[PDB]
Amino acid sequence: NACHVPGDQIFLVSNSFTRRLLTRTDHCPKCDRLSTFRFMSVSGMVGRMPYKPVDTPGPSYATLYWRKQRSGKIASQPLNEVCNK
Amino acid sequence: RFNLDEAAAELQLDEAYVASLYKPLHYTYSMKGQRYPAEQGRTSRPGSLAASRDRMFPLYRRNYKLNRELRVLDHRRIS
Amino acid sequence: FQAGVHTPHGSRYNAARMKNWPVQEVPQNFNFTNEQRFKAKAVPRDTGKIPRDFLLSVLYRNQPCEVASLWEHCLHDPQIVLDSKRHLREVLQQARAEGFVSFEKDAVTDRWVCHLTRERFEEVRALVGARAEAQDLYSGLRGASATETSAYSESFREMNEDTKREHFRLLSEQVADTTTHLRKFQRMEMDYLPYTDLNGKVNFMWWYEMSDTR
Amino acid sequence: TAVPHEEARSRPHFPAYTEDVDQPMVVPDGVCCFNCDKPIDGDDINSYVWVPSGNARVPTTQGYFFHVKCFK
Amino acid sequence: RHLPVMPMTPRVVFEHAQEKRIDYAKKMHRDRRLVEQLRTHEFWGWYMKLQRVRGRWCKEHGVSSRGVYGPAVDAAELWG
Amino acid sequence: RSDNVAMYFVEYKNRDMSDNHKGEDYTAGPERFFLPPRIIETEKGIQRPPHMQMAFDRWASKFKTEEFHHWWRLRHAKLRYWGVRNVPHPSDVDPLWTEKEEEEWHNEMLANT
Amino acid sequence: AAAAAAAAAAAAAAAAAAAAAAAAAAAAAAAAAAAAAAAAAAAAAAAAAAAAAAAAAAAAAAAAAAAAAAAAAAAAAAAAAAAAAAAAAAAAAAAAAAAAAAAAAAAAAAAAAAAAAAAAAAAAAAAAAAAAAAAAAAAAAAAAAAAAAAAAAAAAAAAAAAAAAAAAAAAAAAAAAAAAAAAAAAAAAAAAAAAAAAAAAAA
RNA sequence: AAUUAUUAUUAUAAAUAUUAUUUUAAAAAUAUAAAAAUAAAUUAUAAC
């Protein structure tokens, strides 16, 4: 969704927060920086759509391709943990 | 707090250049733009004193010097 | 975390407990409804700089590491910054996009094996070293004489020549079994406060301290 | 792309800022001005032009790089 | 024979000035992006101090910023 | 008066056990809108939170510069051109925040230094 | 205007409505807007000899029919990376840079192709001459690494048994540098004994 | 363009400044604009 050189992160679309949509500086996941993340992928809506169910926004295609690749491998870390605590 | 002047020492430009970037480009240079006709200043009434938009907005005065170095080249640079 | 909310009663770890959080005694016959466990949302754990380096420290002592030894090693430290086996799974998802860990499985076996990536292993030694630069110096009995270290200063070179793992059969448990007596003497408290960064996202700020429980 | 049978974009034939997470498109660490051989700043300056082609030539992402006064 | 000098024909003094207003129009657009960082960078730097003076003031006054409920509700590993 | 719209005065109820407005008063506003507002005279040296001022002192000290004054006066020129009556000429316009004027607020200014 | 009007503004909207002209910004609504607004300058097409280097190689591998639309397919197959700066038109820039400078002439049979290489098949021989046997040399210089990258483990096959025998070196002290403040004196001495009960008999 | 009005007067140069004008507590017609049906973008719709 928002990606720069170091790491990645997940955000959302608080309609007040638009001037951060394209390029929001952020503390990078890696060691340290106030990296200037850009906008990579849509990830759906904050509030619902009038008389439209919660699934009408839709995150993105590549965002599905993201968590299925960023997280993705729950079969690779079913060690020490599964969906439970 | 962030201070432009104490910042320009990190950029070495000057005081009067960092500011011109953070106010419209008719308050420093010689481009086209109209201020507001109340800011133009008045005469001296029987009651009130005089005014002048160099005594009312000393910061908004055109920096005709800084225009010399940046946007207009000399005649002794191309001789 | 509680006695038997999500995992049946008897699943307690000798780990860094959270501050102020009591062991709320859940009665024995209690059970969830399978449709109550539907949502089952829980508290997000701190996966930051303190746990990561800590996570690497135990992955740095063991460049390969397997399933259970992933958590079975965190018990072998003076200071731990985990509370559960899910707090171990949590940071690992972080440490992958940190390029710190690219763990795999050996084809001849059928277990998943840790490995600090070689695109970052040379530098993470400083990160485990910046923890280590005062990890040895702050020790107390080290600095009380010389005959305790001098009764051992010569073994480190003669161990790994002809008695290498001979000592490692003890260097795992006996040198760490006292930390279990110490885990009952000094845990760490994952004191936390929630907040929001100016982008708006929610996150916490964790003030880690050792519990002087005694 | 091999979008199944010419199922690409209708009005512009291309969308804006299609999700770039697949390839990070990061500037190199070792770099050179393709014509003047000058090291180039990473990502906070406009004084370098990236030429990201389908192919890859110059540095490590290998889209060409000039200095803004080195393209002549 | 002397070194070559193409005179200042009105065209070449027209390009010599173009070459100047460009870098100026670039320099502005350059260090419009330089103090921009020093402002944003110092903002968050000031802010991370704010959440930390806020923090170690709450840890001293019982203000847990967590809801009316006690800590036991967060111990449950449930939202509820 | 601009549009005959009835003005309501919404407010939060319990403000005695509050933290940051434990003893504030809202009969009329402060002297210049960037000061800590009036307080109930029984609680003068009452300790407000130490951070809800760091977002105030950081803020109430942008209206103290000469450039803001050149905004405050310019804003009049904008208005009389924009037709708003009753806006006195930008010539005779008192500055918002001066130096000597501040000492009166520098009176109760001996908390931490 | 429904997308703008509906209260909860979506995510697509916030990215669509943006037509700003700052760096790394919405390019469509920067393109869509006025020609006085766009600084969307000309697409830097590479006509490098490098673009000749991934040209004279391929044809001598497959010089048949229809090499003008599925020629880019080769560019989508033969991929260390493609060749066309813009697959769309740079691959159509490939023949004109080839047709000019007297390098490649077309071939037309039921359709137009890029065959016959235009009498420069000698400079295609000594192009591939500078290919495999250039790729051959550089992949073994990293094998010089990989003749000692075996040793990279081997130089620390002992050290990872050594400096994990150093990982106790401090802990053994710190195991008892905290025992000091709990005072076993029996589990304390033996934990220092059972270590030194076999430490001096080693070597 | 009668104006402090439908308006980037743009020959040129350009790219991460939140750089500073838009009232109202009701109802219809109209005006813009809008979930569902007789592989595509369309309908008509004088429907929320």
Q: What is the DSSP string of C13-70?
A: -SS-PPTT-------TT----TTTTTT---PPP--SHHHHHHHHHHHHH-SS--HHHH
Q: What is the Cα–Cα distance from B7 to A81, expressed in whole angstroms?
A: 50
- The separation between CA G73 and the C-alpha centre of its own chain, rounded to angstroms, equals 20
Q: What is the Cα–Cα distance from C108 to D13, expressed in whole angstroms?
A: 49
How many CB pairs (< 8 A) connect D and G? 51
Residue C127 φ/ψ, nearest 5 degrees: -65, -40
End-to-end CA distance of chain E: 94
In eight-state DSSP terms, residue C122 is H
Identify, with chain letter, the residue nearest to nucleotide H13 (CA–C1'): E22
Dihedral class, residue G177 (left if φ above 0, else alpha if ψ from -120 to 50, else beta)? alpha
Q: What is the Cα–Cα distance from F26 to G77, expressed in whole angstroms?
A: 75
Q: Whose CA is closest to A40, among A15, A81, A70?
A: A70
Resolution (A): 3.4
- With contact defined as beta carbons under 8 Å apart, do G56 and G102 qualify? no
State whether A21 and G14 contact (CB < 8 Å): yes
The nucleotide closest to D5 (CA, C1' atoms): H39
Q: Do chains G and D touch (3 or more CB pairs under 8 A)?
A: yes
- With contact defined as beta carbons under 8 Å apart, do A66 and A3 qualify? no
| CA separation, residue G114 to residues G48, G54, G55, G128 (Å) | 19, 14, 11, 18
Q: Which residues of D are annotated as a binding site for Zn(2+)?
A: 33, 36, 67, 70
Give the chains touching B; criterion: ≥3 Cβ pairs < 8 Å.
E, F
Q: Is the dihedral of CA C135, C140, C143, C148 positive or negative?
A: negative
Q: Is C210 helix (H, G, I), strand (E, B) or coil?
A: strand
| CA separation, residue C60 to residues C73, C117, C128, G170 (Å) | 11, 11, 8, 15
Q: What is the Cα–Cα distance from F67 to B60, expressed in whole angstroms?
A: 9
- The number of beta carbons lying within 10 Å of the beta carbon of residue G23 is 11
Q: Do chains F and G touch (3 or more CB pairs under 8 A)?
A: no
State whether E41 and A34 contact (CB < 8 Å): yes
G55 at D interface, C-beta within 8 A: no
Task: Return the residue in C7, C191, C195 with the most chain E beta carbons within 10 A, the one to mutate for interface testing.
Answer: C195
Dihedral class, residue A44 (left if φ above 0, else alpha if ψ from -120 to 50, else beta)? left
Q: What is the Cα–Cα distance from F24 to F36, expressed in whole angstroms?
A: 9
CB-CB neighbors (< 8 A) of D17 in chain A: 39-40
As given in the structure block, the two tokens for residue B19 are 């500011």
| CA separation, residue B21 to residues B66, B69, C124, E20 (Å) | 12, 15, 43, 18
Q: Which residues contact C164 (CB under 8 A, 6 or more apart)?
A: G161, G165
Which segments of chain E does DSSP mark as H helices, in order?
12-31, 35-58, 72-75
How many CB pairs (< 8 A) connect C and E? 52
Which segments of F31-112 does DSSP mark as H helices, in order?
66-72, 74-81
Q: What is the Cα–Cα distance from A22 to G15, expressed in whole angstroms?
A: 7
Q: Is the dihedral of CA D37, D41, D47, D51 positive or negative?
A: positive
C162 at G interface, C-beta within 8 A: yes
Residue G124 φ/ψ, nearest 5 degrees: -100, -30
Q: Is C176 helix (H, G, I), strand (E, B) or coil?
A: helix
As given in the structure block, the two tokens for residue E72 are 């036991």
Burial class (CB in 10 A: 0-12, 13-18, 19+), D38: middle
Q: What is the Cα–Cα distance from C187 to C14, expressed in whole angstroms?
A: 8
Secondary structure (H, E, C), chain G? CHHHHCCCCCHHHHHHCCCCCCCCCCCHHHHCCCCCCCCCCCCCCCCCCHHHHCCCCCCCCCCCCCCCCCHHHHHCCCCCCCCCCCCCCHHHHHHHHHHCCCCCCCEECCCEECCCHHHCCHHHHHHHCCCHHHHHHHHHHCCCCCCCHHHHHHCCCCHHHHCCCCHHHHHHHHHHCCHHHCCCCCHHHHHHHHHHCCCCCCC
CB-CB neighbors (< 8 A) of C5 in chain A: 85
Dihedral class, residue G20 (left if φ above 0, else alpha if ψ from -120 to 50, else beta)? beta
- With contact defined as beta carbons under 8 Å apart, do D24 and A68 qualify? no
In eight-state DSSP terms, residue D12 is S
Q: What is the Cα–Cα distance from B20 to E25, expressed in whole angstroms?
A: 13
Buried residues in F45-65 as b, exposed as e (16+ CB within 10 A) = eeebbebeebeeeeebeeeee
CA A23 to C1' H32, in angstroms, rounded, equals 35
As given in the structure block, the two tokens for residue E8 are 């200042």
E53 at F interface, C-beta within 8 A: yes
Q: What is the Cα–Cα distance from F66 to F77, expressed in whole angstroms?
A: 17
Q: Whose CA is closest to F98, among F63, F56, F58?
A: F63
Write out the H or E segment, with its range, that includes residue D64.
strand D64-67
The bases of strand H with some atom under 7 A from any protein CB are 4, 8-10, 12-21, 23-25, 32-35, 40-41, 48
